[PDB]
Design an enzyme around this catalytic site. Structure first.
Site, PDB file in Angstrom:
ATOM      1  N   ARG H  46       0.825  -1.035  -0.064  1.00  0.00           N
ATOM      2  CA  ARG H  46       0.004  -0.039   0.032  1.00  0.00           C
ATOM      3  C   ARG H  46       0.661   1.262   0.099  1.00  0.00           C
ATOM      4  O   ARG H  46       1.656   1.466   0.627  1.00  0.00           O
ATOM      5  CB  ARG H  46      -1.096   0.092   1.083  1.00  0.00           C
ATOM      6  CG  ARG H  46      -2.201  -0.792   0.889  1.00  0.00           C
ATOM      7  CD  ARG H  46      -3.338  -0.807   2.235  1.00  0.00           C
ATOM      8  NE  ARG H  46      -3.614   0.574   2.460  1.00  0.00           N
ATOM      9  CZ  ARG H  46      -4.573   1.129   3.499  1.00  0.00           C
ATOM     10  NH1 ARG H  46      -4.929   0.208   4.337  1.00  0.00           N
ATOM     11  NH2 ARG H  46      -4.869   2.239   3.869  1.00  0.00           N
ATOM     12  N   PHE H  51       0.089  10.436   2.638  1.00  0.00           N
ATOM     13  CA  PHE H  51      -0.402   9.953   3.890  1.00  0.00           C
ATOM     14  C   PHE H  51       0.705   8.895   4.415  1.00  0.00           C
ATOM     15  O   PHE H  51       1.317   8.973   5.491  1.00  0.00           O
ATOM     16  CB  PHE H  51      -1.561   9.465   3.916  1.00  0.00           C
ATOM     17  CG  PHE H  51      -2.149   8.712   5.016  1.00  0.00           C
ATOM     18  CD1 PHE H  51      -1.777   9.364   6.186  1.00  0.00           C
ATOM     19  CD2 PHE H  51      -2.886   7.516   5.075  1.00  0.00           C
ATOM     20  CE1 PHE H  51      -2.432   8.830   7.398  1.00  0.00           C
ATOM     21  CE2 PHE H  51      -3.230   7.061   6.317  1.00  0.00           C
ATOM     22  CZ  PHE H  51      -3.144   7.756   7.596  1.00  0.00           C
ATOM     23  N   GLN H  54       2.733   1.500   3.381  1.00  0.00           N
ATOM     24  CA  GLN H  54       2.471   0.189   4.293  1.00  0.00           C
ATOM     25  C   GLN H  54       3.022  -0.715   3.555  1.00  0.00           C
ATOM     26  O   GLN H  54       2.704  -0.985   2.296  1.00  0.00           O
ATOM     27  CB  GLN H  54       1.192  -0.005   4.860  1.00  0.00           C
ATOM     28  CG  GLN H  54       0.879  -1.099   5.873  1.00  0.00           C
ATOM     29  CD  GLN H  54      -0.503  -1.602   5.965  1.00  0.00           C
ATOM     30  OE1 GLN H  54      -1.487  -0.599   5.791  1.00  0.00           O
ATOM     31  NE2 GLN H  54      -0.910  -2.601   6.442  1.00  0.00           N
ATOM     32  N   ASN H  93      -1.575  -2.046  12.726  1.00  0.00           N
ATOM     33  CA  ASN H  93      -2.353  -3.051  13.438  1.00  0.00           C
ATOM     34  C   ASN H  93      -3.760  -2.915  12.937  1.00  0.00           C
ATOM     35  O   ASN H  93      -4.377  -1.953  12.322  1.00  0.00           O
ATOM     36  CB  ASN H  93      -2.000  -2.888  14.774  1.00  0.00           C
ATOM     37  CG  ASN H  93      -2.300  -1.582  15.286  1.00  0.00           C
ATOM     38  OD1 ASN H  93      -2.434  -0.543  14.498  1.00  0.00           O
ATOM     39  ND2 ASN H  93      -1.866  -1.201  16.554  1.00  0.00           N
ATOM     40  N   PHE H 104       4.405   0.611   8.786  1.00  0.00           N
ATOM     41  CA  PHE H 104       3.757   1.648   8.639  1.00  0.00           C
ATOM     42  C   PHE H 104       4.694   2.914   8.611  1.00  0.00           C
ATOM     43  O   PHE H 104       5.357   3.292   9.489  1.00  0.00           O
ATOM     44  CB  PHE H 104       2.444   2.182   9.750  1.00  0.00           C
ATOM     45  CG  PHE H 104       1.872   3.311   9.367  1.00  0.00           C
ATOM     46  CD1 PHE H 104       2.355   4.391   9.390  1.00  0.00           C
ATOM     47  CD2 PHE H 104       0.238   2.914   9.099  1.00  0.00           C
ATOM     48  CE1 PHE H 104       1.409   5.683   9.436  1.00  0.00           C
ATOM     49  CE2 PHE H 104      -0.342   4.164   8.731  1.00  0.00           C
ATOM     50  CZ  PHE H 104       0.184   5.336   9.006  1.00  0.00           C
ATOM     51  N   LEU H 113      -3.019   9.049  15.057  1.00  0.00           N
ATOM     52  CA  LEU H 113      -2.640   7.682  15.234  1.00  0.00           C
ATOM     53  C   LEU H 113      -2.091   7.335  16.564  1.00  0.00           C
ATOM     54  O   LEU H 113      -2.040   6.203  16.771  1.00  0.00           O
ATOM     55  CB  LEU H 113      -1.636   7.438  14.081  1.00  0.00           C
ATOM     56  CG  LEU H 113      -2.040   6.897  12.568  1.00  0.00           C
ATOM     57  CD1 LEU H 113      -3.132   5.541  12.694  1.00  0.00           C
ATOM     58  CD2 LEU H 113      -2.449   8.154  11.869  1.00  0.00           C
ATOM     59  N   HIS H 117      -1.791   3.283  17.225  1.00  0.00           N
ATOM     60  CA  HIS H 117      -0.474   2.749  16.640  1.00  0.00           C
ATOM     61  C   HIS H 117       0.729   3.320  17.284  1.00  0.00           C
ATOM     62  O   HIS H 117       1.090   4.193  17.525  1.00  0.00           O
ATOM     63  CB  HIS H 117      -0.392   3.326  15.213  1.00  0.00           C
ATOM     64  CG  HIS H 117      -1.573   2.664  14.193  1.00  0.00           C
ATOM     65  ND1 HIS H 117      -2.758   2.895  14.485  1.00  0.00           N
ATOM     66  CD2 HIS H 117      -1.402   2.107  13.274  1.00  0.00           C
ATOM     67  CE1 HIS H 117      -3.511   2.218  13.224  1.00  0.00           C
ATOM     68  NE2 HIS H 117      -2.594   1.799  12.620  1.00  0.00           N
TER      69      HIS H 117
END
Ligand SMILES: [Zn+2]
Ligand SMILES: [Zn+2]
Lengths: 20, 43, 132, 276, 310, 142, 98, 157, 54
Positions: H46, H51, H54, H93, H104, H113, H117
């Protein structure tokens, strides 16, 4: 005297997974 | 098959975008139901 | 094979009876024959059968409901949207240019090739500090 | 009160038009033959005038919400009254219709005609009607004002007596179309046949500016209805409380961050906001 | 592990019904397939090889809602909403005979696989008819006060598993013509009762979207309810969903109203599979009786999906 | 400032970041390269990047085309296939009988659909009425 | 659309948008032109000349880098070397000779 | 002290610092999964511009992920560690206490986050490479349309 | 951060390019954002007018 009907058999896929 | 039930029962990791339908107004998929059921609910 | 119709138009009942006619009418915008989806109403007093009025190409490009021809996001008449939010899509309106543009857009969409709220916020900023 | 029938049924029927030709074309239903220039200059007076004060009333459509008005009531020619399937009364400011249709239940075209008459167009929000062919007198403004306050709720009444032509800007689509189809070839005090068309947009920069401003205020009204009031206040930037609320909410710690609008002013299923 | 079976494809879509399929059953040697559907027709397929529709059986005047096979797999057993039962011959494709004596729609039936041959029909007039497959007249019939949508024969061949709209499984005895005992606990209308292959567990899915497994054994506590599996919600239609057991009695497969067939583990209650592939409700979800991982799901998409469980 | 003492010391420039990467133990608005505050809907193509981490000007060649379209847009496409540095072993073999037959079935299905439409075009049935009208039920989630 | 590979038409449209100071428009045009016609030396010359007359020496260098990627004739490499010798980066010109 | 790891990629090389005394569980997990060659040849499944990037799935589909402590473990949110800006590691997660193995690597300050996270690392060498990773063409699911592969990941000394 | 200033053992300033995008805007996204000077634009436009007049 079993006559053959109009059925057909085609391999396919089960599509997208469904949520529970 | 895409395994059995373990990968169907788990969430995708990571957060979503802070920032899929097919019709503009919504989502529509074909289906087959008995016409009597539709008539009963319509009535 | 399914109209893009807002809940304002689809009459009352979640179980709706809809008729379909191929090449049933010409689009009110691009004047090309398209598939008409006509449903019933919330009263058996005038059997008008509120129907689609624009094609899915013109529904998709100008982003509006097929029956009432107003915006899907804000619910504006589409000229109000294209004149206040501005830009987006002018769209030709002449005799041969109209079907030319519609023909090319449909040909592109069939062949695969192809921020409204941002301009809404910018409109709010132009209007909040405005003075006649 | 019940709706009053205006004309007895014995007068109105499906009659062939006047024989302005040598043979009647029964497909197009027109008198073919003879001259074509004479038909273009053959306007005639209407066959009756409606008055809302003495003829409007209850009908079958009044009990039915989401109906359409009666075009043949506006011309004063509907001969049944109470048993007509459409409304018999002046539209209000709350009688709002979709852009696809006018107030009479007729399909509404994408562009106007050569002579700027008929139903209308959903490609331009037009509340202004042209009223020409007015005999030139000294009190044109008074008679236009009374005869158009008869037919609804006006916003502007530009009149040009020097050649005698009027521009009447109502406040609603429905009232504009009702006044247009109600005064079609209807008489003034002088025995004349009025020319009530749609009005082309004025080139007066002011009128263009205010019609534009009406477009953006309508869009702003719909957007403010669609968005949460918290979002509208927090974006609006006039209340100091709204400004400091915006800072504190779109801080999330990390002093001096000031999150982008695409993330701060984002609506979604999960989102990062109070939502609503 | 791509594919471990004898089918020529990991999935096959059997189509050809012009109406909704309600039941589909396997030949007890796991070789022949019979599907009855609302177009009043029983379509007969092969499962191994190119899988041709070798037969069609016509002769019911209304919708077909059940069918079982014989001991060998030579005589078919069709219940239909023309208030009738019928025994069919597969050597000629003709019909042996029809069984008459019900007054309303027949929902269930069961053939005794071993013991003595009896057909057991639950019918909406409130009756459970016991028929001999040689005479058209009913040998006996048991009277209830509610419609019956579910029926199973005991291993010992004398107890009858009725399930009605009165929300409880009733076990009757044929000789005394009276109910032995009722396993209650369901909340909605019972649809399927299938005994375990070894013979000590009973599957029961009802309209409350819950499938429960109960005891059969003579020594049992007051509450014979083993488990209440969940995870197969019922759709818009109030169809009679037909579940089944695997050969080893370990997997429970029940169709659902979203087009997905759901398999739990009968030992513990863990969702083994949630297989998609259908548009309307899945009516009949069955296993291969031979023990192969073959599963069949006949759904009112007018279709059957014959698939694998690897 | 190395590990683990950066407390109080705030970076003010991307050189204060070392080589870059924001420091998570200092609470402050850190930007390791710069600021992209607001671009007023600049209608330029987004500058993407190719596989080796360089600018890609084939995004001008591929514009207005589907993603599955073969477009030669670089000098590498002019080199003979053996002399390219990608590979040296290429299977120049026809498709096997199974996949030739699968292609035959798919193409035959599509062309048979077009044949049927053309046969309805060239001689339509005298009445265009299909009284065997079956309903089509659609689940609509807006 | 009617004449896609015509060099005269491409140059006319680029120059028609350069005479009216539409620099961003004309640079889009030049990228499209040397994408469509990569082996036409006139379009590449016009793009390097336009980039050098606008003062963007790094722009002229990136256009020349794309052209040298396309493996052009001798005159193009010579022009690139004369550019770097005009501006004095002699080590860069040495790399271009390599 | 900080421990360095080496994510060699197709688009460049990345050298990361990890904090042993802030979040010992997650960083020690990262050592054990990096040294075994678990990330070797994986795909950054991803990428979302402005942003996040991942990656860490061996299948590269955002479903699975294996840690040496079983399947999952707990979360550690130190109040001193935040989501300050670009080039900061995190455990991607599912929910609370659902840390697996996909990580990430953020591209912008995202201070929402925190508390959900955990933060366990930071980047030393290679940050224009991270800019290029943010600038790769994607699909509507935001997988890269090209092949971003993590070939190698080794502890530097 | 793109250019790194170092001092060698001989004691002089050397600028080392971490990227290769100093002398050329290739492999650099900032090329999309450059604005040419008004004087250079006027110079190019005037040269075009001179060629047209000739
Ligand atoms: Zn159209
Ligand atoms: Zn609508």
């Amino acid at each position: 005297t079993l006559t053959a009907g109009p059925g057909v058999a085609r391999p396919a896929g089960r599509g997208a997974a469904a949520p529970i | 098959v895409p395994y059995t039930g373990e990968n169907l029962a788990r969430p995708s990791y990571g957060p979503a975008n802070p920032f899929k339908n097919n019709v503009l107004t919504g989502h529509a998929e074909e289906m087959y139901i008995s016409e009597a059921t539709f008539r009963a609910k319509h009535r | 094979d399914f109209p893009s119709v807002c809940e304002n138009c689809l009459p009352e009942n979640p179980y709706v009876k809809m008729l379909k006619e191929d090449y049933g009418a010409e689009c009110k915008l691009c004047t090309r024959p398209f598939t008409v989806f006509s449903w019933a109403g919330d009263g058996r007093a005038h059997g008008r059968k509120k129907r689609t009025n624009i094609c899915l190409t013109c529904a998709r490009l100008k982003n509006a409901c097929q029956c009432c021809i107003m915006d899907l996001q804000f619910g504006l008449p589409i000229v109000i949207r294209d004149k206040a939010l501005e830009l987006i899509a002018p769209g030709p309106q002449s005799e041969i240019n109209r079907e030319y543009f519609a023909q090319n857009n449909e040909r592109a969409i069939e062949e695969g090739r192809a921020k409204t709220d941002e301009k809404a916020r910018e409109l709010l900023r132009r209007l909040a500090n405005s003075k006649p | 009160r019940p709706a009053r029938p205006q004309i007895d049924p014995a007068l109105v029927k499906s009659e062939r038009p006047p024989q302005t030709g040598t043979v009647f074309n029964i497909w197009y239903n027109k008198w073919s033959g003879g001259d074509r220039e004479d038909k273009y200059l053959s306007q005639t007076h209407a066959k009756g005038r409606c008055n809302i004060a003495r003829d409007s009333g209850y009908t079958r459509a009044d009990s039915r919400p989401g109906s359409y008005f009666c075009l043949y009531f506006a011309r004063g020619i509907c001969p049944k009254g109470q048993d007509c399937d459409y409304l018999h009364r002046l539209p209000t400011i709350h009688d709002i219709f979709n852009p696809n249709v006018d107030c009479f239940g007729r399909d509404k075209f994408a562009d106007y005609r050569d002579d700027m008459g008929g139903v209308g167009s959903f490609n331009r929000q037009n509340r202004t009607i042209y009223v020409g062919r007015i005999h030139v007198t000294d009190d044109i403004e008074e008679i236009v004002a009374r005869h158009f306050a008869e037919w609804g709720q006006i916003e502007r009444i530009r009149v040009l007596n020097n050649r005698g032509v009027a521009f009447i800007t109502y406040t609603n689509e429905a009232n504009a179309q009702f006044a247009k189809e109600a005064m079609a070839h209807q008489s003034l005090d002088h025995n004349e046949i009025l020319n009530v068309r749609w009005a082309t947009a004025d080139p007066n920069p002011l009128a263009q500016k205010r019609e534009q401003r009406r477009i953006e205020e309508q869009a702003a009204e719909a957007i403010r209805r669609a968005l949460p009031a918290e979002f509208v206040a927090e974006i609006e930037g006039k209340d100091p409380e709204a400004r400091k609320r915006r800072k504190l909410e779109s801080s999330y710690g990390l002093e001096g961050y000031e999150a982008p609008d695409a993330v701060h002013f984002a609506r979604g299923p999960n989102a990062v906001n109070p939502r609503g | 592990t791509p594919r471990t079976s004898n089918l020529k494809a990991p999935l096959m879509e059997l189509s050809g019904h012009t109406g909704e399929i309600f039941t589909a059953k396997f030949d007890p040697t796991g070789t022949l397939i019979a599907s009855g559907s609302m177009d009043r027709t029983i379509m007969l397929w092969r499962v191994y090889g190119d899988c041709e529709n070798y037969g069609v059986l016509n002769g019911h005047k209304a919708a077909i809602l059940d069918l079982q096979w014989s001991r060998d797999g030579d005589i078919l057993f069709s219940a239909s909403a023309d208030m009738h039962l019928a025994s069919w011959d597969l050597t000629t494709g003709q019909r042996i005979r029809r069984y008459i004596g019900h007054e309303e729609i027949i929902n269930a039936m069961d053939v005794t696989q071993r013991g003595e041959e009896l057909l057991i029909s639950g019918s909406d007039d409130g009756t459970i008819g016991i028929w001999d497959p040689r005479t058209k007249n009913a040998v006996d019939y048991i009277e209830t006060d509610f419609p019956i949508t579910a029926v199973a024969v005991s291993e010992a061949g004398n107890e009858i598993y009725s399930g009605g709209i009165d929300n409880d499984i009733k076990v009757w005895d044929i000789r005394k013509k009276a109910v032995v005992h009722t396993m209650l606990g369901h909340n909605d209308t019972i649809t399927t009762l299938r005994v375990s292959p070894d013979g000590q567990q009973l599957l029961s899915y009802a309209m409350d979207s819950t499938a429960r497994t109960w005891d059969i054994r003579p020594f049992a506590p007051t509450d014979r309810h083993i488990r209440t599996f969940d995870g197969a919600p019922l759709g818009l239609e109030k169809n009679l969903i037909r579940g089944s057991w695997s050969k080893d009695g370990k997997k429970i497969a029940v169709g659902a109203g979203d087009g997905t067939v759901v398999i739990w583990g009968s030992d513990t209650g863990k969702l083994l599979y949630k297989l998609p592939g259908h548009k309307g409700t899945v009516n009949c979800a069955e296993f291969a009786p031979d023990g192969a991982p073959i599963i069949l799901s006949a759904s009112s998409d007018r279709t059957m999906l014959l698939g694998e469980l690897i | 400032p190395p590990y683990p003492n950066r407390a109080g010391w705030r970076p003010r420039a991307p050189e204060d970041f070392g080589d870059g990467g924001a420091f998570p133990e200092i609470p402050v608005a850190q930007y390791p390269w710069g600021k992209n505050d607001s671009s007023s809907k600049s209608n330029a193509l987004v500058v993407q990047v190719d596989s080796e981490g360089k600018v890609d000007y084939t995004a001008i060649a591929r514009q207005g085309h589907s993603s599955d379209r073969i477009i030669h847009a670089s000098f590498k496409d002019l080199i003979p296939l053996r002399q390219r540095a990608e590979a040296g072993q290429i299977d120049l073999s026809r498709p096997s009988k199974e996949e030739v037959e699968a292609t035959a079935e798919r193409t035959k299905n599509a062309l048979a659909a077009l044949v049927s439409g053309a046969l309805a075009a060239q001689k339509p049935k005298n009445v265009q009425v299909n009284t065997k009208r079956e309903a089509t039920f659609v689940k609509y989630t807006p | 659309d009617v004449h896609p590979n015509n060099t005269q038409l491409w140059i006319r449209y680029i120059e028609a948008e350069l005479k009216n100071r539409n620099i961003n428009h004309a640079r889009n045009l030049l990228d499209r032109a040397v994408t469509r016609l990569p082996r036409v030396s006139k379009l590449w010359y016009k793009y390097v000349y336009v980039m050098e007359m606008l003062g963007d020496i790094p722009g002229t260098r990136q256009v020349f880098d794309r052209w040298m990627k396309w493996e052009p004739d001798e005159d193009a490499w010579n022009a690139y070397i004369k550019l770097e010798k005009r501006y004095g980066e002699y080590e860069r010109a040495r790399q271009i000779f390599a | 002290m900080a421990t360095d790891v080496a994510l060699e990629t197709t688009m460049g090389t990345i050298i990361l610092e990890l904090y042993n005394q802030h979040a010992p569980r997650t960083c020690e997990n990262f050592k054990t999964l990096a040294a075994r060659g678990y990330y070797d040849g994986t795909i950054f499944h991803r990428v979302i511009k402005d942003f996040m990037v991942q990656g860490g799935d061996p299948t590269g589909t955002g479903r699975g992920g294996r840690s040496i402590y079983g399947d999952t473990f707990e979360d550690e949110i130190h109040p001193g560690l935040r989501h300050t800006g670009a080039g900061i590691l995190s455990m991607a997660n599912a929910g609370p206490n659902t840390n697996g193995s996909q990580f990430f690597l953020t591209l912008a300050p995202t201070p929402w986050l925190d508390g959900k996270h955990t933060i366990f690392g930071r980047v030393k060498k290679g940050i224009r490479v991270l800019q290029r990773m943010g600038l790769v063409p994607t699909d509507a699911d935001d997988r890269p349309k090209t092949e971003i592969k993590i070939i190698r990941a080794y502890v530097v000394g | 951060g793109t250019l790194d200033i170092i001092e060698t053992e001989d004691g002089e300033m050397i600028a080392v390019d971490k990227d290769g995008t100093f002398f050329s805007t290739a492999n650099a996204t900032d090329f999309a954002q450059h604005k040419p000077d008004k004087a250079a634009v006027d110079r190019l436009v005037a040269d075009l007018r001179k060629a047209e007049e000739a």
